[PDB]
Amino acid sequence: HLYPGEVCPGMDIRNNLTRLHELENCSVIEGHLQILLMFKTRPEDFRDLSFPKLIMITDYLLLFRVYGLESLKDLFPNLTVIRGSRLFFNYALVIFEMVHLKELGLYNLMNITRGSVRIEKNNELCYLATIDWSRILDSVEDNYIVLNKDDNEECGDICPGNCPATVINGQFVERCWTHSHCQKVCPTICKSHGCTAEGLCCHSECLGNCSQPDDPTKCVACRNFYLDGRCVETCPPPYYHFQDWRCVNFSFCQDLHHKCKNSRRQGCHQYVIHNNKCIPECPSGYTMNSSNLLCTPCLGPCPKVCHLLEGEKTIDSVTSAQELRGCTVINGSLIINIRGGNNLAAELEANLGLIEEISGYLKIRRSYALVSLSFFRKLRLIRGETLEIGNYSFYALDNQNLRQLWDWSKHNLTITQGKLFFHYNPKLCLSEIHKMEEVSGTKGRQERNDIALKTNGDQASCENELLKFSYIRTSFDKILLRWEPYWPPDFRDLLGFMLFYKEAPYQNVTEFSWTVVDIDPPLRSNSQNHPGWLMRGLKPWTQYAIFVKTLVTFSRTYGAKSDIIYVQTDATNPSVPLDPISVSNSSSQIILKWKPPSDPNGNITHYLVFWERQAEDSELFELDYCLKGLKLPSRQILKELEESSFRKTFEDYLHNVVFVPREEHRPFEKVVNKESLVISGLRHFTGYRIELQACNQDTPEERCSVAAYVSARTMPEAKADDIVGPVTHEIFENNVVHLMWQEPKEPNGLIVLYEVSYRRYGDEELHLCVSRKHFALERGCRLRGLSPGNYSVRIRATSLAGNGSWTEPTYFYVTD
Amino acid sequence: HLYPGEVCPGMDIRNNLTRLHELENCSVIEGHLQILLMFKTRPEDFRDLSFPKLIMITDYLLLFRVYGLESLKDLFPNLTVIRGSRLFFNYALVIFEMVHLKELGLYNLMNITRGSVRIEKNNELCYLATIDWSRILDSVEDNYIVLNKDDNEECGDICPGNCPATVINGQFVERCWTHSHCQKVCPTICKSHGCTAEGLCCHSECLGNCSQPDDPTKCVACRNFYLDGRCVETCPPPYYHFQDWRCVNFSFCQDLHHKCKNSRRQGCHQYVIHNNKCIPECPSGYTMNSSNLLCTPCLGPCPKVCHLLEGEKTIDSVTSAQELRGCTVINGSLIINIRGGNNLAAELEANLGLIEEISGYLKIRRSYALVSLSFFRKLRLIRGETLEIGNYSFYALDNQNLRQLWDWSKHNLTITQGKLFFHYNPKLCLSEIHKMEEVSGTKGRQERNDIALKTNGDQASCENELLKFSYIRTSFDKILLRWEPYWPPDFRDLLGFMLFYKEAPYQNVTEFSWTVVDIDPPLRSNSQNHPGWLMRGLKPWTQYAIFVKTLVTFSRTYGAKSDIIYVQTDATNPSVPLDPISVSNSSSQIILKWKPPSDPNGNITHYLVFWERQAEDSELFELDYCLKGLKLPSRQILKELEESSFRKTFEDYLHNVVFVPREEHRPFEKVVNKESLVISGLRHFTGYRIELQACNQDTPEERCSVAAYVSARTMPEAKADDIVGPVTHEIFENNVVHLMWQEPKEPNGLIVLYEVSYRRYGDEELHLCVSRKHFALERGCRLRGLSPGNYSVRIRATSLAGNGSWTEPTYFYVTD
Amino acid sequence: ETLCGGELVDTLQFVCGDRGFYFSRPARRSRGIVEECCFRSCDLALLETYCATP
Amino acid sequence: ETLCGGELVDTLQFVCGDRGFYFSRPARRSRGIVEECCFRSCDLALLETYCATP
Amino acid sequence: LCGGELVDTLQFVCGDRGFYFSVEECCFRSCDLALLETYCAT
Amino acid sequence: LCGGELVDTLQFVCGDRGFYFSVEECCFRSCDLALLETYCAT
């Protein structure tokens, strides 16, 4: 839908709510809105005010100490988009010292075209962490939200969610504006074109919200431009773009220019026309033509001067730099001082970089986020007419991240008067400063203590003297190092090389953990001897990043370093497979588990595992298990630097004074690409000795680890211990019963004893031990002294597993 | 003895040994000896040269690259004492690049009056660590002996020793000069007066060596002065002291002055007389009088000017400063640069400090050992006519230990032109520099970047703003801290306090281990709230050194610190006495040993130890010990700094834009002052439960530790288990023998069983178990079925300790 | 006594009180409030001059 | 090519050779040997001028 | 440190003044003594 | 490191060149590779 209402260019409301009635008919604001400094107000005075008509804010919204305000959900229920044409300290929405605020309430905010949001020192506001700024802004990292109620306190963010949720780091979370409304999140197929409540994509030109999808006529905010409600991406003539958000007929711009001309308002601009744009003033190369408002190109190279108040300007924010947008010649001096933490290269290049000549000096002080001065795209000459105090034209102080000053493969520079000045630039180096001096042409305009040697690049390896490595080769466990010798002009100043080495997982490692070792300088060969060094201890088959750096006393500094060279250690014999556990589930199936060794030290080609058969313990055969006690098992430096310098300075004194001018085949299997194994075909109730070992190399000889010993025992069968065969008995003249029974040739390990229970009708049960020797020497049992009658005989076989089943009652009749 | 021979003033021998014959008649040298630069020489050319006459060297001895020399024991066999009047780079004996030297050989060196010894880069000399420089020099720490054969190699210092030996750090070692001679060490009663071979003390005036003890007439070198052999401490007139080692008649000095006057030698001095001293020139305030050689005081304040070549002079050694000795006005500039490691304050004050005015500038660069500029005792005015490059009059660069500049309670200063310059003085602070500026009077002569704020005193706590502690009290385990609040002029710059605490064994601890903890700045009270802090974890009863230091951003710096306040934690309950071991040696004596607890936490007043009696184990009575199995027991930050600064700089921008101008009694004993105890009166073969615990406080309630339980068992008696009383037996009709015997009422613990062995004549021995129940229910033993005849009965009692002695064979006759 | 950001606002609206702070138009002077009262000591008149009606 | 202490002596007695180094008397010039060959490059004549006879 | 065991800290920092219960401030976060002084009220 | 075990290091730094025995330089001191290269002579 269209915007019915006065555009009402931006204004500010202060000191009384009676001034808030100017927005009674306002759908758009061609300016900035500032509601701030409210002291004699109460929350009871805010329940009535509401502005459903407000849709779009061009510049920014600022709220500062408005007492009695608890939520904006009743103030701006239709704030859709903020253009952010001009920001307030590179912030498009500032909420500062917002006492009594509880929830933001801006449940209709969709997009912020340019800028960031800074909300802090509210002490009462929550419902902040439950929002998704990614769908709202374009650079979340530029936000600044601290010192609210959210962090120091624990105001519960209770809200429906129902409402959409999304991940931010590693977990999902509902995105809600207030306790009744939540952020409108819809599929990414409509990146910024808008989307209705159901989910239909709005028109491509549309932005934020729309009523009828795919219909620009019924939109609420369209990104490109605006005209007569039915906005289009670019309006045709005779409509000229105005303030980058709408276009109007030539008559409007002409009468606005006439109004500013006849009414000498100090803030009005003589608007001109340049490429269908009613801009306040066209850039350099055009002249304001009295006949037609358009400014035709001039027949002369006259630049657009940029006069500065009191000949100075501090660039500390995007809005500070935007005042110089379109300017090309500065009639003053520039002092760049960006106390930040977020880089501003893009916006600085957008606003600056079109300037060519600076009348005064250029000074960069205390700037932090600046990584380079490359945003001065067309900086050519620095006249230095207004010389800086101390007679300087260039400045640099406490720049923590000034890496590169300019790209001198193509760039040009010229300084007329003054001298350079560099101090405390840990990321800037003397090579770039000397290039500055050479290119500028002020070589003979330098003095002592203007470019400190020990402050610039103190933590940046930039001596730009390269060192080669002669030959290196890594052996089975260790590595040897060797490099070409280096010598400064005075060989006594070399105190030895610094060697840096660390384990680099991937091919890229940062330059300047990082364990170091001291190297004694080599003897003066005056055949030349390579210094070299032998390492001590390492973890094999790892990518090691190594480079060497010389260490020379400061007298000029002429050190040297080498490129980061990656050396790969070879492979070795693996360790024991971790956690060897074997479990048996079936009569012939034993499952053994293991983990790869802690240090594989080699691509494990196969596992060589052996299972071996053992005989029963020798002492078991010679132990009787009917004797009582028959428990059968159920089987600091500066001094060193000076000492070199003190030694050196004595020799210089001495020379000056003196000289005056005139296999067992255990079954095995090569387990390949498996940390486990299942073995079949094993005897019942028989133990196994398992020899486990791993190999990581097969074709070029088997490089195998050490053996690991584990014990595995199988469960027995069902009816293996039961005695089979008839129970034959021999009766002598003395009624001696000599029992015959065939032993279980395949028992559960071995049968230790036998239990015979013969009971007569009305008698009781007797017992007798039949040991291995008893079963051997007597060839079974030998019963003596049995009372007359028929006995019911049962025999129990006692094996290693346990007592076997009672045999069926056998009846034998002796004479009465 | 006297010195027979020409004094032969100091000279140097170079390029041929044929020039070494000038010392054919020389007992003393009034100068320096330099033997150096010998290339075409061989050791075969040195076996003949010997100078037994040389005794005394005035200035110094220097040897530099004399090829073929292996030992000086044949060159200077009588070098007794070296005066060291003028040194060679503050060294009285330099041996540099001494190739082919093996042993020093100066076995006759006794004393060196002033200077030090530097021997280095010989690569062949050993027999160095086997010497005692303490008895030779006066300041051993000023020596410099490195890069010899002694350290990098292992030349055996085999020598007699026989010869005297002495300690140096913690062990004795023989002090030998060569393989045949050793350092002469004699009792300290003769500190430097000398001592003969036997041990008799020489004359007090004598020095080093003497022939007849307590006789100056027969001395070889006397410390004070010399005349006609029989030297005296101070010669009377008409003898005037000459060169601080001898005195001569006035005629000698007069003719020497006349010889220098008529013969215009460039190096000769017009010697004068001043206080019986034929000095080269008397100091300021006297005039050279043509009539009498003495210089009478003048009627005018004319100082002694000190003209300098090329208007500059570098002071880097004692010999460099000695050229200015006696001077008071310098017609040039002074550049002090002492590359050292040993302080030179004493000698600099001796030579310098008599100067008052400096025509040019004073510059101190790279000096290390200088802790203060106080040696300029009478420095008053610095004219600065010859201004330093850059228009400076005072300089300071890379002074690693410049603590104090001057004592401004009394000192005065005046600078005419130029400006101060201070850079990289970590031990110097801005307070002293501002005092410099105030006292000098050049306050309006300062510019930016002449006194760096972040380099001077960067590691010296000198903000000189004191902080008090409100109240503190330490409890049983922990300590609470509280101090008065502090606020810089801009309260936003305070980022919180730094708290430092460490354990200080003794009352003195160094200022600026040292564990630290961050303190959040207190809320703006605008009643004032004290910040305070609570500690976490400590070791009780320890002297803790605590102080707090503020941390304020660099915008001027207005931090604050507190005095080092020592707080003593109270005492606590001790731990278990370490290593509780108890050993028994006698029947009633048990010795228990223990160590004091690892943390006593209290002065151990006494030890409360209890020994308790126990009963025999209940299951022992119910266990039979004749059953098989009878085993009876034989009983990084910069981001945080900027975040505060970034938050501050946005607040300033907002304000500028918005506002616009118009108990069981177990026997116990309090073991006092003893880590052991011996207890008496204990029952034989009876165990003891020992409850060991310690107390460190008695009168104000017994603060006692936890109990420690140990077990102690006593050895038995001799004949306690033997059965006493007659072996009465009752015989029934069935020949049942019922044995009666009285049990050992006081046994070794308890008798478990009895062994009875009755044997008839020609029969064998029988056995029977008599258990506790068997002995109780049957009231002894009950034998059944004994064959007719007389049996020899023996009874063995089996107790806890073991089997008792066999009873005497008892005979009883049953009917046949 | 010097006063800086944060407490400067509370000092205001009390020295001024009742009436607010005047505002015509932006029309930087580089001498707004910080270098008047925070960096250097400032008196009562320098705060009174920022009122609206008087 | 610049030569400094240590090796300067070995360079001497070879460029000079045979004859030694002259010596009359101390008679500092602050320009003896170090600031001639160590700090800055020096030629053969600057070493030849330190001989004795020629 | 946590509940029950932590009472000695408020007894330390408050003396004979007493306190009301609340552990959530130092069982998970850190006891900085800032909350402890205000926990006991005169 | 000491004798017997140390031989691998001279084999490492000397290759197929061989060496003569002497351990007193690395069992108590440190192996800086300076002596090891000179220990094996061509």
Numbering used by the authors:
A (entry chain A), B (entry chain B): 1 to 161, 168 to 518, 528 to 541, 545 to 573, 577 to 656, 691 to 717, 754 to 907
C (entry chain D), D (entry chain F): 6 to 32, 37 to 63
E (entry chain C), F (entry chain E): 8 to 29, 43 to 62
Authors' account:
Insulin receptor (IR) is a receptor tyrosine kinase that plays critical roles in cellular signaling, growth, and metabolism. IR can be activated by two highly related ligands – insulin and insulin-like growth factor 2 (IGF2). Consequently, IR-B has an additional 12 amino acids at the C-terminal helix of the alpha subunit (α-CT), while IR-A lacks this segment. Here, we present cryo-EM structures of full-length human long isoform IR (IR-B) in both the inactive and IGF2-bound active states, and short isoform IR (IR-A) in the IGF2-bound active state.
To reveal the mechanism underlying IGF2-dependent IR activation, we determined the cryo-EM structures of full-length human IR-A and IR-B in the presence of saturated IGF2. We expressed and purified the full-length of human IR-A and IR-B with a kinase-dead mutation from HEK293F cells. The 3D reconstruction of class 1 (determined at 3.6 Å resolution for IR-A/IGF2, comprising 16% of the particles; 3.7 Å resolution for IR-B/IGF2, comprising 14% of the particles) exhibited a T-shaped symmetric conformation with four IGF2 molecules bound at the canonical site-1 and site-2. Our cryo-EM analysis shows that, even at saturated IGF2 concentrations, only about 16% of IR-A particles and 14% of IR-B particles adopt the symmetric T-shaped conformation with four IGF2 molecules bound, while most particles are trapped in asymmetric conformations with two or three IGF2 molecules bound. The site-1 binding of IGF2 is mainly mediated by the interaction between A- and B-domains of IGF2 and L1/α-CT and FnIII-1 domains of IR in a fashion similar to the site-1 insulin binding. In addition, the C-loop of IGF2 also makes weak contacts with the α-CT, CR and L2 domains of IR. In contrast, the site-1b interaction in the structure of IR/IGF2 complex is mostly driven by the salt-bridge formed between Glu12 of IGF2 and Arg539 of IR. IGF2 binds IR site-2 (the side surface of the FnIII-1 domain of IR) in a similar fashion to that for site-2 insulin binding, but their detailed binding modes are different. The buried surface of IGF2 binding at IR FnIII-1 domain (424 Å2) is considerably smaller than that of site-2 insulin binding (681 Å2), indicating that IGF2 engages site-2 with much lower affinity than site-2 insulin binding. By contrast, only four IGF2’s residues, including Phe19, Asp52, Leu53, and Glu57, are involved in the site-2 interaction.
